[model samples]
Target: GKPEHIPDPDAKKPEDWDEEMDGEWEPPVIQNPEYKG
Candidate 1:
């Protein structure tokens, strides 16, 4: 099985972060395409 994208709590500090954890924050999308306004 393929590995999942899980967050490592031990690497919370800026100096201890890996490349995968360093990126711009993106908010979760709200799925409401068929809304009537």
Candidate 2:
């Protein structure tokens, strides 16, 4: 199941946190989906 909210490892405080902050950041580069290319 998908998480209702995500945690920010960069967040400095609890008040700086949020549960509805969607698409507020850039997408991280992920490795190849197929590792055995």
Candidate 3:
């Protein structure tokens, strides 16, 4: 009865994104091998 994976807030992002595909690229963490934070 626990979370499917650890929730760490390190790979931060800016708080300003009203548009799509501005510049940077973000990826999903569950698809990562190091999602064990």
Q: Quote the lDDT for 9 in model 3.
A: 56
Each model's Cα RMSD:
13.0, 9.6, 6.9
Model 1 lDDT tens row, 1-37: 3233333444334555455766754333343444443
Badly placed stretches (over 4 Å) of model 2 are: 13-37
- Candidate 2, residue 20: CA error in Å? 31
The global Cα lDDT (0 to 1) of model 3 is 0.52
Q: Assess candidate 2 and give its TM-score to the true structure.
A: 0.24
Candidate 3's residue-wise lDDT over 1-37, tens digit each?
3445544456555577543767764533444445444
Worst 10 residues of 2 by lDDT: 23-32
Q: Model 1 TM-score?
A: 0.26
TM-scores of the candidates are 0.26, 0.24, 0.25
Among the numbered candidates, top lDDT falls to 3
Better of 1 and 3 by lDDT: 3
Off by over 4 Å in 3: 14-37
